[PDB]
Design a protein around this ligand. Structure first.
Ligand SMILES: [Mg+2]
Ligand SMILES: [Mg+2]
Ligand SMILES: [Mg+2]
Ligand SMILES: [Mg+2]
Ligand SMILES: [Mg+2]
Ligand SMILES: [Mg+2]
Ligand SMILES: [Mg+2]
Ligand SMILES: [Mg+2]
Ligand SMILES: [Mg+2]
Ligand SMILES: [Mg+2]
Ligand SMILES: [Mg+2]
Lengths: 50, 208, 109, 245, 102
RNA sequence: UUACCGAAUCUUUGAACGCAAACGGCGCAUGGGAGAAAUCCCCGUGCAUGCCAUAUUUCUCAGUGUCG
RNA sequence: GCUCUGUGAGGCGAGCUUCACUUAUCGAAUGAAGAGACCAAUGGGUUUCGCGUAGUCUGCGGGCUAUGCACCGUCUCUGAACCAAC
RNA sequence: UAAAACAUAGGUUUGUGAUGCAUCCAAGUGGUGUAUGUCGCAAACUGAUUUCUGCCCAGUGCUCUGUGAAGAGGUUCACCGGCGC
């Protein structure tokens, strides 16, 4: 609903902008290991219960 | 504009309540600590501090102590580039002067934080046959010596001008203690009734 | 002379008792970057209203004072919101005496 | 086993008195100097129902003895204590209904309520509705009147002890049958989580000493010893006799 | 040798004078907090044996301690496991009462 | 740029301590700031409790404690 | 049972209980809100601290027991209300 | 397993005058009934009303009525200290 302490909004805000595909250019670095983001989250699956 | 102060009329002007007030605990307790030890039966060893040198005699003696001050720190240093007669003061120094019997009068203070510090002292002067007197306050032996408290004072010696002034005091002093040493080692003290209970008994016997 | 059932402690006298720039907040910390979305471009021209991501801890009155200092223009109002992302977003509306368009383009926008 | 319900009421958790809507303690006025050397007139202001209590409580408003303020004060009402009545508490209070006057000054044989056992404790005996205690003797030589407690029970108390005059109001509550399980639901709504009372034989062997077994029966005498440890002291306690009388 | 007098005066704790002084204190101390700082020791000669010196930075405290044995804090007084380890009232704390006050 | 280390920087918190707290809340005092027809607004610092020391120009006091 | 636990007066028996006492302790009430006295002692002793009597004692200064003086000690069937007129 | 059980009102009985009764707590100037005060509280049994609850108190339960002596001493012997009825 509407209610959120801003501290919770800052955290969902945190996880929200953290919920992004890895940059394309990061995969092109030497010795790179990363491909997909292993910490992609989906609201319908993992829950950030705050 | 006179006011009735019957019950259920004009409110009273604020009368003193010191008597029924609830005091800070340290107040109630120093009051009760003083009550408690009048109305218990104190031992003769400890009661003797309740008995004490007559003040006209006391005032004479403390003026004598004041006549023989210990030298001040400013002067003691100044003397030592090369002591003036003064009263022995301090429980440790005064204890020697008794045992060595160099003391020729001693002035136990009446009150002491643990009376134990001095509780023995009257028996010790009585044994060395040193004249001694109990006196009202360690604060007065205090100022007499320039200290803020003195558990004891010892007139070990005096200039010739004050020889007799000491002697009459020594016999006005051991007249009350050392002479009464047989009496003093006997009087159990305390057991005073409250005068709220003395009067109650004054009247119960009044009614019978 | 006590006149309370209980004692109360007396008034006693009581004796009265490195960054070169201590104020880390600043016009330049408050306002950050103008926003260039097309909801905001609707406001610069249609509402005389600059949009800014602005420091999230800044408040409205500080955002006015910051526009006054950074862009030299009065803000008739500044209703901020903090974005779902966590950035704060001010829609500052300029006084009519100040164009929001002449100023935004002066701003490199 | 497992903790008996008699023992759990002592935790006083769920089992505490309700009393949110209770008006506060229903006591006599503080034993002022005025009580001890005169009287205080307070007018009854309003007779309240304290929920969970049978007797109405009165709201006598005494003027404060020592300061300019008026001191409303709450005590369980004697019957016939109408609002606007002027109560008179104090040693030389007139002897009338609602007046609170020293017990040794109340006439022998007259009935009193809200009596205080210890002097100055502000009224502890005879407070339940309909209840009272006749004064059955004075002993002016030793200053201790006797009185008959609302239970057939004599007791000596100092005459300096206050008492109110008359029966406590609201008498006869108990005479009316409750009829409904729901009616007794509400008398205990304002009291405590006392009710309903499950029988211990209906309980399990873990729950109660009486519990368990096939036919539901106590297996041992229901008359427990006074020294029985808690959780055992159920059934009839230290009973001197059993049986209908 | 004032210590020698004040030390043996306290060796007579049972003497009626010392028994009286101690009486008034225990009365006096009951009406005080479990810890109480003193500007001076009740026993100057005894405190000084133990290293107290009337100096700045030395302070004395009178710490009260209830007497009698420990009651082991098991619930409802019940004890589980072996019968040896039962016993609530009679097992004693294996710690000194000067220790507990210190 | 790397490596190291002295100078600093070190946001909100946290023992967390000015008071709170699913509140990015609210103080009092101190100085600053912007500003403005002062009010508002931001900022810095102090402000928890306990205890020890001290009042160094020796703080203010309380006690039907002891005396004088 | 001991202890907490003191104090006086008894009696009994070879420290036991009655009886009062009150400072421990306990309970109660209270916002610790008015206790006792002045009405006077088988009471007190530092501004009252002191005298006088008999008995005894003396560190010759006084003590102590009894005792009486003094002195401590002395005054009289719902109203409103405060913020004082030595 | 929704009953026939539990509850229930009604009935009785027990404790109990606050120094209380029941009762929580390791512990306390701690806690619950109790903001209460016998028309109350705590404990039990029975189970509306109408009607009746006979006989048995034997059992069981409940209730009620340190000081001497010996010894060198450790010690030992002796005397006083809730039950039974
Ligand atoms: Mg789901
Ligand atoms: Mg949420
Ligand atoms: Mg908003
Ligand atoms: Mg069952
Ligand atoms: Mg069982
Ligand atoms: Mg059945
Ligand atoms: Mg059955
Ligand atoms: Mg904080
Ligand atoms: Mg049934
Ligand atoms: Mg029936
Ligand atoms: Mg039958």
């Amino acid at each position: 609903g509407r209610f959120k302490p801003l501290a919770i909004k800052k955290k969902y805000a945190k996880k929200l902008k953290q919920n992004r595909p890895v940059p394309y250019w990061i995969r092109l670095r030497t010795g790179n290991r990363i491909k997909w983001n292993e910490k992609r989250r989906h609201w319908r699956r993992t829950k950030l219960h705050y | 504009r006179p006011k009735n102060f019957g019950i259920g009329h004009d409110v009273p002007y604020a009368r003193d309540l010191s008597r029924f007030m609830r005091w800070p605990t340290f107040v109630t307790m120093q009051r009760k600590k003083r009550v408690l030890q009048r109305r218990l039966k104190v031992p003769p060893a400890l009661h003797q501090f309740t008995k004490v040198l007559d003040r006209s005699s006391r005032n004479e003696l403390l003026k004598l102590v004041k006549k023989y001050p210990s030298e001040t720190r400013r002067a003691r240093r100044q003397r030592l580039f090369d002591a003036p007669l003064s009263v022995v003061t301090g429980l440790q120094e005064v204890t020697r002067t008794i045992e060595k019997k160099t003391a020729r009068l001693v002035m136990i203070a009446n009150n002491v934080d643990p009376i134990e510090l001095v509780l023995w002292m009257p028996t010790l002067c009585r044994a060395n046959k040193v004249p001694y007197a109990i006196v009202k306050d360690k604060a007065r032996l205090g100022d007499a010596v320039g200290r803020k408290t003195a558990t004891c004072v010892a007139i070990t010696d005096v200039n010739a001008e004050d020889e007799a002034a000491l002697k009459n005091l020594i016999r006005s002093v051991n007249a009350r203690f050392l002479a009464r040493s047989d009496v003093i080692r006997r009087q159990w003290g305390g057991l005073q009734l409250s005068l709220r209970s003395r009067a109650e008994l004054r009247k119960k016997r009044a009614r019978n | 002379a006590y006149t309370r059932p209980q004692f109360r402690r007396p008034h006693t006298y009581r004796r009265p008792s490195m960054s070169a720039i201590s104020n880390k907040w600043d016009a330049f910390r408050v306002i950050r970057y103008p926003l260039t979305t097309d909801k905001a471009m609707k406001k610069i021209e249609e509402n005389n209203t600059l949009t800014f991501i602005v420091d999230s801890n800044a408040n409205k009155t500080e955002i006015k004072k910051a526009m006054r200092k950074l862009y030299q223009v009065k803000a008739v109002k500044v209703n901020t919101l903090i974005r779902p992302d966590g950035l704060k977003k001010a829609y500052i509306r300029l006084s009519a005496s100040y164009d929001a368009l002449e100023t935004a383009n002066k701003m490199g926008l | 086993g497992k903790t008996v319900l008699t023992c759990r009421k002592g935790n006083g958790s769920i089992y505490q008195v309700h009393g949110h809507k209770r008006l506060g303690p229903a006591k006599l006025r503080i034993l002022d100097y005025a009580e001890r050397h005169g009287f205080m007139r307070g007018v009854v202001k309003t007779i309240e129902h304290e929920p969970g209590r049978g007797a109405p409580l009165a709201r006598v408003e005494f003027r404060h003895p020592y300061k300019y303020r008026r001191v409303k004060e709450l005590m369980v009402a004697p019957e016939g204590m109408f609002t606007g009545q002027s109560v008179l508490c104090g040693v030389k209070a007139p002897l009338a209904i609602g007046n609170v006057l020293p017990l040794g000054q109340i006439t022998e044989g007259c009935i009193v309520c809200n009596v205080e056992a210890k002097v100055g404790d502000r009224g502890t005996i005879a407070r339940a509705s309909g209840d009272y205690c006749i004064i059955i003797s004075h002993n002016h030589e030793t200053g201790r009147t006797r009185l008959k407690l609302p239970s057939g029970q004599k007791k000596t108390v100092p005459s300096n002890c206050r008492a109110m005059i008359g029966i406590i109001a609201g008498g006869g509550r108990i005479e009316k049958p409750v009829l409904k399980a729901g009616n007794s639901f509400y008398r205990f709504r304002g009291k405590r989580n006392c009710w309903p009372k499950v029988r211990g034989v209906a309980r399990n062997p873990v729950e109660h000493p009486h519990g368990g077994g096939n036919h539901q029966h106590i297996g041992h005498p229901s008359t427990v010893s006074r020294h029985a440890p808690p959780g055992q002291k159920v059934g009839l306690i230290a009973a001197r006799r059993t049986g209908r009388i | 040798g004032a210590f020698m007098y004040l030390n043996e005066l306290w060796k007579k704790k049972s003497s009626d004078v010392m028994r009286f002084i101690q009486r008034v204190r225990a009365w006096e101390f009951r009406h005080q907090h479990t810890v109480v700082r003193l500007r001076r020791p009740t026993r100057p000669e005894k405190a000084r044996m133990l290293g107290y010196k009337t100096k700045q930075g030395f302070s004395v405290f009178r710490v009260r301690v209830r007497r009698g044995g420990r009651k082991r804090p098991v619930h409802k007084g019940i004890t589980y496991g072996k019968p040896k380890t039962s016993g609530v009232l009679g097992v004693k704390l294996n710690k000194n009462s000067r220790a507990i006050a210190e």
